[PDB]
Amino acid sequence: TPESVSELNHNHFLSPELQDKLDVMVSIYSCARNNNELEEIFQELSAFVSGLMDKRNSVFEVRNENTDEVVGALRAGMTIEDRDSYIRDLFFLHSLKVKIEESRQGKEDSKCKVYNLLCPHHSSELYGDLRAMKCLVEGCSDDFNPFDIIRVPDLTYNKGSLQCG
């Protein structure tokens, strides 16, 4: 319960700063045409994602890797506020990805560099979290769907017994 959340609270929604940063990127992305115009937007997300990955490694800890008995946990001297501030930054990525998928309804195969940041590899840490976020926001997802509960920062994803590769 301290390490992770099952369902999203009022603390997990976007702040006015993140909401303003989201709306500016969405407006700039759709109205832009050439790949040269998106270089300002690409450098934002790649800076944001690399900052988001550092925020995970400072906040969270994975004990007992490559086993059945894998457990997630918060780092020493790290509060519940530090978790929810990461999940806010994680929500930003999901909600930005949703609106980019709306802007790419026509040509759904452009090979965009900005979109490929929001589609990380299926072994990665961020894929585990974004797939976890998608289940809670968009309702279940129904990929396999057992009795087990979904963790909104999936710390144990691809780190035990069976792994991708």
Partner: protein, 245 residues
């Protein structure tokens, strides 16, 4: 019947010379922080299993670890540049992460250490008759241990003048069906390679390459809660019986 069909010009490849040929093994284990790809632990066990295995089959085996995407291409190009006149065969094993791709000929891609892909399409076309003329009418094998796509499979319930074309004699053995994940135990190693080496021990002397990978496909298909279906894109003209002393 068994021994007679081996030594046949029409139905089987001739592997007379010692060694058979070169055997490149790209083994990408440790990937960069920027890509976010997890460290493929237990692939060094799979690497050394195959390294001993192809050495037992009379191949000049050469392992190259943690290659970037550009070094993978330079490593494959330099192999194709060799004089395979005296050589009868050629093998290229690749152990890495993978992904789904907008393919034209062959599905799948394989990542480098830098974390950008090299398509299987591109890897195979390096060894075609135009680019590598020394392997003309010679089997060119490829064993690609990597993920096909992001999708995890649960499966279903079951009750218990001489004419020879440029892309001839290609054989790309896939570890998982295109668009599905390849599974791996950190201690044991990959399901594909663990099952490949075990079957190559027991049935290399009697059975051909296609018959061997049928056992690998069967043995891997029964495994685990999550499922995996290995196969191969066969473009061979004859049966490939591996040589053992």
């Amino acid at each position: 019947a068994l021994e007679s069909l081996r030594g046949n010009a029409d139905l089987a490849y001739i592997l007379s010379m010692e060694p058979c040929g070169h055997c490149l093994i790209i083994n990408n284990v440790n990937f960069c922080r920027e890509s976010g790809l997890r460290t493929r632990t237990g692939s060094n066990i799979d690497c050394e299993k195959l390294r001993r295995r192809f050495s037992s089959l009379h191949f000049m085996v050469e392992v190259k670890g943690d290659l970037t995407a550009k070094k993978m291409v330079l490593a494959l190009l330099e192999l194709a540049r060799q004089d395979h006149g005296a050589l009868d065969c050629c093998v290229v094993v690749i152990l890495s992460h993978g992904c789904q791709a907008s393919h034209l000929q062959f599905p799948g891609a394989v990542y480098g250490t830098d974390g950008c892909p090299v398509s299987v399409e591109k890897i195979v076309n390096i060894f075609n008759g135009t680019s590598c003329p020394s392997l003309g009418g010679k089997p060119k094998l490829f064993f690609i241990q990597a993920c096909g796509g992001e999708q995890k499979d649960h499966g279903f319930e079951v009750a218990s003048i001489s004419s020879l074309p440029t892309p001839s004699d290609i054989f790309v053995s896939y570890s998982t069906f295109p668009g599905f994940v390849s599974w791996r135990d950190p201690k044991s190693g990959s399901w594909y390679v663990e099952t490949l080496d075990d079957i190559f021990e027991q049935w290399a002397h009697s059975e051909d390459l296609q018959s061997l990978l049928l056992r690998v496909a069967n043995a891997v298909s029964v495994k685990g809660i999550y499922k995996q279906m290995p196969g191969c894109f066969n473009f061979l003209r004859k049966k490939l019986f591996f040589k053992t002393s």
